[PDB]
Amino acid sequence: GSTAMATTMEQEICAHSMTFEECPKCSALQYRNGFYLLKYDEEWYPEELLTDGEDDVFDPDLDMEVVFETQ
């Protein structure tokens, strides 16, 4: 194709919407779509994305305190 990585034709061809170059951004490797944070269909999607679950956790359970089952 063109002189681009992974023979990108610059016509946005991938499993997902973007180009091969933009595949990691498209979360092509993951096959889990990055956009739409609140995914009702997917389980604990915002939590998975969040580095720290302290804000998004109920009061009786503290992620910091318990090493196991940390979100």
The reply on whether position 14 binds Zn ion by CB under 5 A is yes
DSSP string, 2-58: -SSGGG--SS--SSSSS-STTTTTTTTTTTS-SS-S--SSSSSHHHHH-S--STTS-
Nearest residue to 39 (alpha-carbon basis) of 30, 49, 29 = 49
Q: Amino acid letter at 61?
A: D
Q: Which range binds Zn ion by CB under 5 A, 9-17, 30-38, 42-50, 59-67?
A: 9-17
Q: Which of 13, 16, 63, 71 binds Zn ion (CB under 5 A)?
A: 16
Q: Which of 1, 3, 21, 26 binds Zn ion (CB under 5 A)?
A: 26
Is 19 among the annotated ligand-binding positions?
no
Return residues touching Zn ion (CB under 5 A). Answer: 14, 16, 18, 23, 26, 28
Residue set of the binding site: 26, 50-54
